[PDB]
Design a protein around this ligand. Structure first.
Ligand SMILES: *CCC(=O)N1CCC[C@@H](n2nc(-c3cn(CC(F)(F)c4ccccc4)nn3)c3c(N)ncnc32)C1
Length: 276
Protein backbone atom coordinates (compact mmCIF):
# COMPACT_ATOMS: atom_id res chain seq x y z
CA UNK A 1 0.00 0.00 0.00
CA UNK A 2 1.14 3.53 -0.86
CA UNK A 3 -0.08 7.08 -0.42
CA UNK A 4 -0.07 7.15 3.39
CA UNK A 5 2.28 8.42 6.09
CA UNK A 6 2.49 6.53 9.39
CA UNK A 7 4.21 8.57 12.12
CA UNK A 8 3.92 7.35 15.70
CA UNK A 9 1.17 4.87 14.88
CA UNK A 10 -0.98 7.54 13.19
CA UNK A 11 -1.73 6.80 9.54
CA UNK A 12 -2.28 10.01 7.55
CA UNK A 13 -3.63 10.07 4.02
CA UNK A 14 -1.18 12.10 1.97
CA UNK A 15 0.07 12.91 -1.51
CA UNK A 16 3.30 14.41 -2.82
CA UNK A 17 1.72 17.89 -2.79
CA UNK A 18 1.33 17.63 1.00
CA UNK A 19 5.12 17.78 1.45
CA UNK A 20 7.20 20.97 1.52
CA UNK A 21 10.73 20.64 0.15
CA UNK A 22 13.19 22.04 2.70
CA UNK A 23 16.29 21.27 0.62
CA UNK A 24 18.61 18.40 -0.28
CA UNK A 25 20.58 16.73 2.50
CA UNK A 26 24.26 16.16 1.83
CA UNK A 27 25.68 15.71 -1.65
CA UNK A 28 26.30 12.98 -4.20
CA UNK A 29 21.43 9.61 -4.65
CA UNK A 30 19.07 12.48 -3.80
CA UNK A 31 17.60 12.55 -0.28
CA UNK A 32 15.41 15.54 0.56
CA UNK A 33 14.43 16.97 3.92
CA UNK A 34 10.71 17.69 3.74
CA UNK A 35 7.92 18.93 6.00
CA UNK A 36 4.50 17.27 6.20
CA UNK A 37 2.16 20.25 5.95
CA UNK A 38 -0.73 18.44 7.65
CA UNK A 39 1.05 17.75 10.96
CA UNK A 40 4.32 19.68 10.84
CA UNK A 41 6.56 16.61 11.03
CA UNK A 42 9.91 16.88 9.26
CA UNK A 43 10.99 13.76 7.35
CA UNK A 44 13.67 12.47 5.01
CA UNK A 45 12.44 11.72 1.49
CA UNK A 46 14.27 9.64 -1.11
CA UNK A 47 13.20 10.44 -4.68
CA UNK A 48 13.55 7.71 -7.32
CA UNK A 49 12.97 9.14 -10.79
CA UNK A 50 11.23 6.97 -13.38
CA UNK A 51 13.68 8.19 -16.04
CA UNK A 52 16.66 7.37 -13.81
CA UNK A 53 19.22 4.65 -14.30
CA UNK A 54 17.60 1.21 -14.48
CA UNK A 55 20.47 -0.17 -12.38
CA UNK A 56 20.26 2.29 -9.48
CA UNK A 57 16.45 2.13 -9.52
CA UNK A 58 16.59 -1.67 -9.38
CA UNK A 59 18.82 -1.37 -6.31
CA UNK A 60 16.60 1.22 -4.60
CA UNK A 61 13.57 -1.04 -4.95
CA UNK A 62 15.32 -4.06 -3.43
CA UNK A 63 16.67 -1.94 -0.57
CA UNK A 64 13.19 -0.47 -0.04
CA UNK A 65 11.91 -4.05 0.14
CA UNK A 66 14.23 -4.87 3.05
CA UNK A 67 13.43 -1.54 4.74
CA UNK A 68 9.69 -2.16 4.47
CA UNK A 69 10.15 -5.59 6.07
CA UNK A 70 12.34 -4.26 8.92
CA UNK A 71 9.47 -2.44 10.67
CA UNK A 72 10.05 -4.45 13.87
CA UNK A 73 13.79 -3.74 14.24
CA UNK A 74 14.48 -0.62 16.35
CA UNK A 75 18.05 -0.37 15.01
CA UNK A 76 17.14 0.18 11.33
CA UNK A 77 15.98 3.51 9.90
CA UNK A 78 12.22 3.15 9.52
CA UNK A 79 10.10 3.93 6.46
CA UNK A 80 7.03 6.08 7.09
CA UNK A 81 5.44 5.56 3.67
CA UNK A 82 5.77 5.89 -0.07
CA UNK A 83 4.29 8.00 -2.85
CA UNK A 84 4.03 6.76 -6.44
CA UNK A 85 3.45 9.44 -9.06
CA UNK A 86 3.51 9.05 -12.83
CA UNK A 87 7.20 10.05 -13.01
CA UNK A 88 8.62 9.51 -9.51
CA UNK A 89 8.63 7.33 -6.41
CA UNK A 90 9.07 9.15 -3.09
CA UNK A 91 10.22 7.12 -0.08
CA UNK A 92 9.59 8.76 3.29
CA UNK A 93 12.00 7.88 6.11
CA UNK A 94 12.31 9.01 9.71
CA UNK A 95 14.56 12.06 9.93
CA UNK A 96 17.83 11.45 11.77
CA UNK A 97 20.43 13.99 12.81
CA UNK A 98 23.60 12.98 10.97
CA UNK A 99 25.94 10.05 10.39
CA UNK A 100 28.92 8.89 12.43
CA UNK A 101 31.28 10.05 9.67
CA UNK A 102 30.12 13.66 10.02
CA UNK A 103 30.07 13.32 13.81
CA UNK A 104 33.75 12.36 13.59
CA UNK A 105 34.52 15.34 11.34
CA UNK A 106 32.61 17.69 13.65
CA UNK A 107 34.26 16.19 16.74
CA UNK A 108 37.72 16.70 15.16
CA UNK A 109 38.94 13.84 17.33
CA UNK A 110 38.16 10.48 18.92
CA UNK A 111 34.61 9.55 19.89
CA UNK A 112 34.24 8.38 23.52
CA UNK A 113 34.02 4.65 24.17
CA UNK A 114 30.67 5.09 25.94
CA UNK A 115 29.11 6.38 22.71
CA UNK A 116 30.80 3.69 20.62
CA UNK A 117 29.49 1.03 23.01
CA UNK A 118 25.85 1.96 22.43
CA UNK A 119 26.67 2.23 18.73
CA UNK A 120 28.23 -1.25 18.73
CA UNK A 121 25.18 -2.78 20.42
CA UNK A 122 22.79 -1.17 17.93
CA UNK A 123 24.72 -2.07 14.76
CA UNK A 124 25.40 -5.70 15.74
CA UNK A 125 21.73 -6.25 16.58
CA UNK A 126 20.75 -4.58 13.30
CA UNK A 127 23.06 -6.89 11.36
CA UNK A 128 21.93 -9.95 13.32
CA UNK A 129 18.31 -9.02 12.63
CA UNK A 130 18.95 -8.75 8.88
CA UNK A 131 20.74 -12.11 8.87
CA UNK A 132 18.41 -14.14 11.08
CA UNK A 133 14.95 -12.82 10.19
CA UNK A 134 15.54 -11.89 6.53
CA UNK A 135 18.71 -13.67 5.36
CA UNK A 136 20.18 -10.33 4.27
CA UNK A 137 23.92 -9.63 4.32
CA UNK A 138 24.71 -5.92 4.55
CA UNK A 139 28.13 -6.09 2.81
CA UNK A 140 28.95 -2.40 3.44
CA UNK A 141 29.30 -1.30 7.08
CA UNK A 142 30.99 2.08 7.50
CA UNK A 143 30.55 5.28 9.55
CA UNK A 144 28.46 6.93 6.81
CA UNK A 145 25.79 4.22 7.24
CA UNK A 146 25.39 4.76 11.01
CA UNK A 147 22.85 7.48 11.84
CA UNK A 148 22.17 9.24 15.13
CA UNK A 149 19.54 11.77 16.20
CA UNK A 150 18.87 14.27 18.98
CA UNK A 151 16.88 11.63 20.90
CA UNK A 152 19.89 9.33 21.31
CA UNK A 153 18.80 6.73 18.76
CA UNK A 154 21.47 4.93 16.73
CA UNK A 155 20.26 3.21 13.57
CA UNK A 156 21.63 1.55 10.45
CA UNK A 157 20.77 2.58 6.90
CA UNK A 158 21.82 2.27 3.25
CA UNK A 159 22.39 -1.46 2.83
CA UNK A 160 22.27 -3.02 -0.63
CA UNK A 161 31.06 -2.35 -1.62
CA UNK A 162 33.58 0.17 -0.34
CA UNK A 163 37.09 -1.26 -0.66
CA UNK A 164 38.34 0.54 2.46
CA UNK A 165 36.12 -1.61 4.72
CA UNK A 166 36.30 -4.88 2.77
CA UNK A 167 37.15 -8.04 4.70
CA UNK A 168 40.16 -10.19 3.71
CA UNK A 169 37.96 -13.02 2.42
CA UNK A 170 35.92 -10.62 0.28
CA UNK A 171 39.19 -9.44 -1.29
CA UNK A 172 40.75 -12.90 -1.76
CA UNK A 173 38.15 -15.73 -1.44
CA UNK A 174 28.79 -14.51 6.01
CA UNK A 175 30.93 -12.79 8.66
CA UNK A 176 32.37 -10.17 6.29
CA UNK A 177 30.29 -7.43 7.95
CA UNK A 178 32.06 -8.16 11.26
CA UNK A 179 35.36 -6.96 9.79
CA UNK A 180 33.88 -3.73 8.39
CA UNK A 181 32.42 -2.95 11.82
CA UNK A 182 35.80 -3.35 13.52
CA UNK A 183 37.46 -0.99 11.04
CA UNK A 184 34.68 1.54 11.64
CA UNK A 185 35.16 1.21 15.41
CA UNK A 186 38.92 1.81 15.20
CA UNK A 187 38.41 4.83 12.94
CA UNK A 188 35.84 6.40 15.26
CA UNK A 189 37.73 5.53 18.46
CA UNK A 190 41.00 7.06 17.23
CA UNK A 191 39.71 9.74 14.85
CA UNK A 192 42.04 8.32 12.18
CA UNK A 193 41.25 5.84 9.43
CA UNK A 194 43.46 2.83 10.26
CA UNK A 195 44.88 2.43 6.72
CA UNK A 196 46.51 5.83 6.33
CA UNK A 197 48.13 7.40 3.26
CA UNK A 198 46.58 5.04 0.70
CA UNK A 199 46.28 6.80 -2.66
CA UNK A 200 44.29 4.02 -4.38
CA UNK A 201 41.68 1.45 -3.42
CA UNK A 202 44.07 -1.37 -4.34
CA UNK A 203 46.71 -0.06 -1.91
CA UNK A 204 44.15 -0.41 0.89
CA UNK A 205 43.47 -4.03 -0.09
CA UNK A 206 47.18 -4.89 -0.05
CA UNK A 207 47.55 -3.46 3.46
CA UNK A 208 44.45 -5.38 4.58
CA UNK A 209 46.04 -8.67 3.48
CA UNK A 210 49.75 -8.02 4.10
CA UNK A 211 49.65 -6.05 7.37
CA UNK A 212 48.45 -7.12 10.79
CA UNK A 213 44.94 -6.10 11.90
CA UNK A 214 44.85 -2.46 13.03
CA UNK A 215 43.76 -2.96 16.64
CA UNK A 216 42.99 -0.22 19.15
CA UNK A 217 45.90 1.58 20.83
CA UNK A 218 46.73 0.76 24.43
CA UNK A 219 47.52 4.28 25.66
CA UNK A 220 44.07 5.87 25.21
CA UNK A 221 42.31 4.38 28.24
CA UNK A 222 40.20 1.92 26.25
CA UNK A 223 38.74 -0.81 28.43
CA UNK A 224 39.86 -4.39 27.95
CA UNK A 225 36.38 -5.33 26.75
CA UNK A 226 36.49 -2.78 23.92
CA UNK A 227 39.98 -3.85 22.81
CA UNK A 228 38.86 -7.49 22.89
CA UNK A 229 35.74 -6.84 20.81
CA UNK A 230 37.73 -5.02 18.13
CA UNK A 231 40.42 -7.72 18.10
CA UNK A 232 37.70 -10.34 17.61
CA UNK A 233 36.11 -8.35 14.78
CA UNK A 234 39.49 -7.86 13.07
CA UNK A 235 40.27 -11.58 12.79
CA UNK A 236 41.80 -11.93 9.33
CA UNK A 237 41.00 -15.64 8.98
CA UNK A 238 37.26 -15.54 8.23
CA UNK A 239 36.83 -19.11 9.53
CA UNK A 240 37.86 -17.98 13.04
CA UNK A 241 35.83 -14.75 12.96
CA UNK A 242 32.92 -15.05 15.43
CA UNK A 243 29.30 -15.40 14.41
CA UNK A 244 26.73 -12.80 15.42
CA UNK A 245 25.56 -15.29 18.05
CA UNK A 246 29.02 -15.20 19.63
CA UNK A 247 29.41 -11.42 19.33
CA UNK A 248 26.11 -10.79 21.14
CA UNK A 249 27.52 -12.59 24.20
CA UNK A 250 30.75 -10.56 24.30
CA UNK A 251 31.25 -8.69 27.56
CA UNK A 252 31.53 -5.42 25.63
CA UNK A 253 28.02 -5.98 24.24
CA UNK A 254 26.63 -7.14 27.58
CA UNK A 255 27.99 -4.05 29.35
CA UNK A 256 26.38 -1.47 27.06
CA UNK A 257 23.13 -3.39 26.70
CA UNK A 258 22.25 -2.33 30.26
CA UNK A 259 24.54 0.64 30.98
CA UNK A 260 22.85 4.04 30.98
CA UNK A 261 24.55 6.30 28.41
CA UNK A 262 23.17 9.74 27.55
CA UNK A 263 23.75 9.64 23.81
CA UNK A 264 21.15 12.39 23.32
CA UNK A 265 23.00 15.01 25.37
CA UNK A 266 26.36 14.04 23.85
CA UNK A 267 24.85 14.30 20.36
CA UNK A 268 23.53 17.82 21.02
CA UNK A 269 26.87 18.96 22.47
CA UNK A 270 28.78 17.84 19.37
CA UNK A 271 26.26 19.38 16.98
CA UNK A 272 26.47 22.68 18.88
CA UNK A 273 30.18 22.84 18.02
CA UNK A 274 31.07 24.66 14.80
CA UNK A 275 33.24 23.68 11.86
CA UNK A 276 31.99 26.56 9.70
C1 LIG B 1 26.99 10.30 6.43
C2 LIG B 1 25.58 10.85 6.29
C3 LIG B 1 25.47 11.61 4.97
O1 LIG B 1 26.44 12.21 4.50
N1 LIG B 1 24.26 11.59 4.38
C4 LIG B 1 24.09 12.29 3.09
C5 LIG B 1 22.73 12.96 2.99
C6 LIG B 1 21.64 11.98 3.36
C7 LIG B 1 21.81 11.59 4.81
N2 LIG B 1 20.67 10.77 5.26
N3 LIG B 1 20.25 9.65 4.68
C8 LIG B 1 19.20 9.22 5.38
C9 LIG B 1 18.54 8.11 5.05
C10 LIG B 1 18.83 7.35 3.99
N4 LIG B 1 17.96 6.34 3.99
C11 LIG B 1 17.89 5.24 3.00
C12 LIG B 1 17.05 5.69 1.80
F1 LIG B 1 15.96 6.29 2.23
F2 LIG B 1 17.76 6.54 1.06
C13 LIG B 1 16.66 4.48 0.94
C14 LIG B 1 15.49 3.79 1.22
C15 LIG B 1 15.12 2.69 0.44
C16 LIG B 1 15.94 2.29 -0.62
C17 LIG B 1 17.11 2.98 -0.89
C18 LIG B 1 17.47 4.08 -0.11
N5 LIG B 1 17.13 6.49 5.04
N6 LIG B 1 17.50 7.60 5.70
C19 LIG B 1 18.95 10.06 6.39
C20 LIG B 1 18.04 10.10 7.37
N7 LIG B 1 17.14 9.12 7.42
N8 LIG B 1 18.02 11.08 8.28
C21 LIG B 1 18.97 12.09 8.21
N9 LIG B 1 19.91 12.04 7.19
C22 LIG B 1 19.88 11.02 6.31
C23 LIG B 1 23.13 10.84 4.99
Amino acid sequence: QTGYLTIGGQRYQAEINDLENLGEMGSGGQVWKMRFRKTGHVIAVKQMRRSGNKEENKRILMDLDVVLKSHDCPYIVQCFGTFITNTDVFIAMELMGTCAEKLKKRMQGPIPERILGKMTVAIVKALYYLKEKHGVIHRDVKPSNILLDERGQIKLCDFGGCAAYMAPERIDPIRADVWSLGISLVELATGQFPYKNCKTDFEVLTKVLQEEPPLLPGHMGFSGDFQSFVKDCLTKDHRKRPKYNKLLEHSFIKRYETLEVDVASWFKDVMAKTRS
